[PDB]
Amino acid sequence: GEEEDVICDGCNGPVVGTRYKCSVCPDYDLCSVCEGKGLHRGHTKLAFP
Ligand SMILES: [Zn+2]
Ligand SMILES: [Zn+2]
C-alpha cells in the first residue's frame, strides 16, 4: 500500500514524534532535533505529531 514517509530535511532521517512542517515551503519537514538546532529559521513551521 501507498505510505507517505516523512523524512527530516535537516538530518535526512525519518521524522518520529513531532513534525515541524514549513508553512511557506511546499513539503519541507524537520525532526524534533534538527528543529532544536534552529535549522530553517526564517520560515514559519507547524508543530504537530
Ligand atoms: Zn533531523
Ligand atoms: Zn520553508
> Count of domains in the chain?
1
Cα 30 to Cα 45: distance, rounded to the nearest angstrom: 9
DSSP string for residues in 4-35? ---B-TTTSSBP-S-EEEESSSSS-EE-HHHH
Cα–Cα–Cα angle for 3, 48, 31, nearest 5°? Answer: 70
Alpha carbon 29 to chain centroid, angstroms? 2
Residue 39 Rama label (left phi>0; alpha psi -120 to 50; beta): beta
Long-range own/partner contacts, residues 22-28 (CB < 8 A, 24 or more apart): 22/46
Residue 9 CA to ligand 2 centre (angstroms): 10
For residue 2, what is its C-alpha cell? 501507498
Documented resolution in Å: 2.8
Name the helix (H) or strand (E) containing 36: helix 32-36
Would you list which residues are annotated within the binding site for Zn(2+)?
A: 8, 11, 22, 25, 31, 34, 40, 43
Q: Method of determination?
A: X-ray
Range of the domain at 39: 1-49
Classify each residue of 16-36 as buried b or exposed e, where b means 16 or more C-beta atoms within 10 Å of its C-beta: eeebbbbeeeeebbbbeebbe
Residue the block writes with cell 507547524: 46
